[PDB]
Amino acid sequence: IDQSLKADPSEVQYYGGYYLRKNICKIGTNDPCDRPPYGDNDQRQRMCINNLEKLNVDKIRDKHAFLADVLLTARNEGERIVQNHPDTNSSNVCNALERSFADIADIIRGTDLWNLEQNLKQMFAKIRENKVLQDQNYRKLREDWWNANRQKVWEVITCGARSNDLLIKRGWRTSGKEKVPTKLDYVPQFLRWLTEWIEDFYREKQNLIDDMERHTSYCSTCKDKCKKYCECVKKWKSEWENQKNNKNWIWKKSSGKEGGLQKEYANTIGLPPRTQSLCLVVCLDEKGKKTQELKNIRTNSELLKEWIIAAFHEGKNLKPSHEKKNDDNGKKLCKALEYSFADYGDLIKGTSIWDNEYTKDLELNLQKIFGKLFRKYDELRESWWNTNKKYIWLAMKHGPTIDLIPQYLRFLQEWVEHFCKQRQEKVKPVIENCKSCECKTECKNKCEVYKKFIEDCKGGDGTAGSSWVKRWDQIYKRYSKYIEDAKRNRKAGTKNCGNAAENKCVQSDIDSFFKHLIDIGLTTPSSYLSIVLDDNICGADKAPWTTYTTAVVVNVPSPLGNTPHGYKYACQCKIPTNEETCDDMNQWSNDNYELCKYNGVDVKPTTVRSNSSKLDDKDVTFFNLFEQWNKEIQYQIEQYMTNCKEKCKCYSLWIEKINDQWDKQKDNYNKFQRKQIYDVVSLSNFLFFSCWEEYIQKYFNGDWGSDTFEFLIKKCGNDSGDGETIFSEKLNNAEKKCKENESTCIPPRTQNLCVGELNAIQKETELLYEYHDKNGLPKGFCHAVQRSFIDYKNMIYIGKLQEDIKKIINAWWKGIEGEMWDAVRCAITKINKKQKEWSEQFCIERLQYEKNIRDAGDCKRKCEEYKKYISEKKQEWDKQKTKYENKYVFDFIFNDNIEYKTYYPYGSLCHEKGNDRTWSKKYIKEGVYVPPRRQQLCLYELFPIIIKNKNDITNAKKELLETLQIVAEREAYYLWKQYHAHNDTTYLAHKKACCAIRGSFYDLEDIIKGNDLVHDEYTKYIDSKLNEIFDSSNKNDIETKRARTDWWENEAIRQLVWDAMQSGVRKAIDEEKEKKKPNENFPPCMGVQHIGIAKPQFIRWLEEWTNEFCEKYTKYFEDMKSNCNIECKKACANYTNWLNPKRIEWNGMSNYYNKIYRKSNKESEDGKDYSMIMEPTVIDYLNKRCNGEINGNYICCSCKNIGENSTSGTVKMKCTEVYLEHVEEQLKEIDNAIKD
């Protein structure tokens, strides 16, 4: 069967993967194919076949690897024949490529006339081992296998060729004047060699007659030389032979005679009618006798004359008859002339994206003309335009301008200008005839006509068949593809001129231009249009292109909206109530349940109904919804307790919404308790547990004293069941928050104070100023008197005075404190007339110690004293950090690891990656959660390196790189030592290990690239110092971030760090002898050195979140299914207590995605580009990513259920009864067995 011969190298996971799918353009036998110009051996048989020459058939995975090897030996010859075939006529480069393809056919099928054949024979023999002898050395097997994979190898040999070709898929002209267009390989190879030879020798004869023109000596030496070889090649005959109409926007592909787009640009941008109606050289009918415009042209002057006269006729065709009285006519005619000039320029240059009946013909004609004119020199055509664009432009303006812009962008600008012309024409009635503040009868239809124009499925009178919205999607798709191609490329940086768009200084190609657009921050078409488009072209309404608008919700830019920006609430003149304004937040909504349903997830009918403890379908659904509601709202209140009048108004409406939602839920739970207990706990005992389990779900992870048990009493319950007042108190606090906002080890000095009696506290502030004095104040004077205030107010060997003052005797103390503040201010004035703290002291002392160390010659003395000082202060900090981190619930300087004391006595060091960490949003600089892998990155050894390089940059690019290598190696080693453990002796273990190591490497790269989203106290200081390392104190955007990116990308470092990662995992593999496991080789998922670009951190964290969520969901679901008495209560409680935080994280990251889904540097709140993200909803994004199997390089997540994350986050029946039994048990525990 044919399907038993067709192969796809994208199938083979790895070689000796998911990269040869749609990206075969750049692709067992480890030997590279190397062996070059065309026609050089005339003094064709020798070709790039070296890869197959050393074919090691032993290490081969079916025929797919063989096809990959053939694809490699075809690509490495196509890319080596495209750039080494001198003809200046792509119709012959095409021929060379097709003849190489035909020679690959012959090599594979064994028909090659001239060690290769043995390897191919054995390969086909082992393929036959895989339909056994149903398709001699397997001649017919070879023929059938070729005829099965004939198309793939052709589209791989034709890749990399210039987007403008003549007979190759990248520009197959029909020449009538998805398949292989040549079908040449079926010709016998002797005939193909004879044709190749005659083409070569006669193109060389043409080159000879050009260089040696017919019109002083040796006027026929080369002619007789060529004739001598023409007689000497007689063996081809008697020797070797015997041995054997107002146009509309097309938007569609070029279907033969009709106009439209060229392929790879079809349905990407529409052709303006002017673009299609452009007068051209061929369309230039001058006189009835066509001879003048026919025949051919001789010199550059004739070509320039044709282009000048065509431009003049275009300008004549581009001016209106009466110009409508020349009032409107003005800048519009000049703009149209500019676009025509640009189109002329890009079609002379040959980088046009539109096609036509005559465009393909004239482009080949221009290639031929430019070849025959500039014989003694692609770049010639662009230079000729850049030199001769002045004359044609001035001819155009008689019927230059900066037009070094990609034709895609100009087409986008013209299409959007037309769209805004129509928009303004149909928005103006709304602006004047209607009004925001005829009240309901005129504005209604004046906005409904606008809606009919906008949501028109036929795309009004601009786009030809799809809605403006759908066509804008095709715009964003193509623009983001351009941006991605510009990002991946490396040879596209600005040219040496010895940011304003420059001609040559700023690099000069499409890729160079898009790299410049990335540099200035325009990575999305909306921002680019907000730049190029002039102000007020879409209406008297200020609807920006960067601000977007909304059973399907479409999120599209403001101009492509159903209603004008601002009139969205005056379309029907609806009440401008603060309610709909506050939407610019919550997500919820008598023997009935007033169910507060999450928008989308409604009531879920339980199907598995068995013997129940009076728990009905509706009761279980309500309990599920209540648990979700009081896990989400109880968190939103604390997350929202932390133009402002509008914010407080919206916030008051928000707290009212939560108040009446809770009022609904109170009655709902009362009904639930009644219907449960009449024939169970209450809100007082549920919300209590719902808080307590937090401490059990965060630091205890599953179930089973002094500074935490009291914290739990003060957090919720107050030693009893008071769930009602736990939540009401925080409701009141949140309610008053914005109203109040709008209303707007002991230190030594504690030893001695102003208690001389045992100027009351006034002599202390004088002696303290005297001590600190040895803006009219020394450094940190206010802090000392502040702590003196704290000590004095806490007061009202030391115990005697507090006891005596207590025997003397708190609003009186408050009055004293106020009078004391007044007296201290008076004391400050009197002094002017005559004219934690331990951390601060330790930091200033350590800075002094660093100065002392750098001031050195007896360096061991000061370093030893520094080390013993740290050792002495360790006891003080041991009792210091806990009391301000355990009571409330830097690290390297007092890291207690032994290996720290071994390697690093200067206050690697990595260790096993504990799996106890969870997802938290801390140190981000909103709504993004840090994965534990990022939280556990090693940066310990980067800290002393940074400290040592104070006021030193010589070692900044030298020592820090070595530290980067060391830390990356240790990170990879420890990740592998913990992820291979996850599944001992399993393939998927090392796959997930590779995924995590790649993620860690990407996060390490982004610590040194742009702004690491996470500002962890290690990376915070690291970036705070290495933005000054690469700084000259000029700027903070181009001086620092661009230089840092150039350091990471172009320096003798990305590859070094990845090689450190590989070396770490190799060390892990070699140290797996105690695991008694095969340490033969390292998994080839780390084999790849170049691993691809890094997508933005939020997207990678989204992928990691999806992977972890789906793996833990499968684990917990299987646990709870296998167990469904203590065996199943644990599974159910674990599932719910893991699902609710994941639902909150899902909602937060979904909101963040919704506000960054297609934004950019100029649009998103952070200066990070998210243009490559292209899906409307996070579910839609993960549906096409987290579906297949993990490969370890590109895919980092696999999931069983993909399109119901929103429903899975809220929901299977008996789980409620076991959860209530668990609640009652944990209650009889925490309320009686721990009470005190």
Numbering used by the authors: 23 to 38, 43 to 53, 61 to 68, 71 to 78, 101 to 171, 177 to 192, 194 to 198, 204 to 245, ...
Sentences from the paper on this structure:
VAR2CSA encoded by a subfamily of var genes from Plasmodium falciparum (P. falciparum) named as var2csa, plays a vital role in the cytoadherence of infected erythrocytes to the placenta. In this study, the VAR2CSA ectodomain from P. falciparum strain 3D7 (~306 kDa, containing six Duffy-binding-like (DBL) domains, N-terminal sequence (NTS), and multiple inter-domains (IDs))8 was recombinantly expressed and purified using the Sf9 insect cell secretory system. The cryo-EM structures of VAR2CSA ectodomain and its complex with CSA were determined at a resolution of 3.6 Å and 3.4 Å, respectively. In line with the previously proposed model, our structures showed that the core region is well-defined and covers NTS, DBL1X, DBL2X, ID2a, ID2b, DBL3X, ID3, and DBL4ε.
Compared with the apo structure, the densities of the wing region in the complex were significantly improved, making it feasible for the flexible fitting of both DBL5ε and DBL6ε. Intriguingly, a highly basic pocket formed by DBL2X, DBL1X, NTS, and DBL4ɛ has been identified to accommodate a dodecasaccharide with six sulfated disaccharide repeats from CSA, which fitted well into the density map. Moreover, 16 residues were identified to be responsible for the direct interaction with 10/12 monosaccharides, except for the 6th and 11th units of CSA dodecasaccharide. Among them, there are nine, four, and three residues derived from DBL2X, DBL4ɛ, and NTS, respectively. Interestingly, a significant conformational change in the core region was observed. Firstly, the DBL1X moves closer to DBL4ɛ at more than 3.2 Å (ranging from 3.2 Å to 4.4 Å) for multi-helixes to facilitate NTS interaction with CSA and close the pocket. Secondly, there was a 1.8 Å outward bend for the key CSA binding helix of DBL2X in the deep pocket.
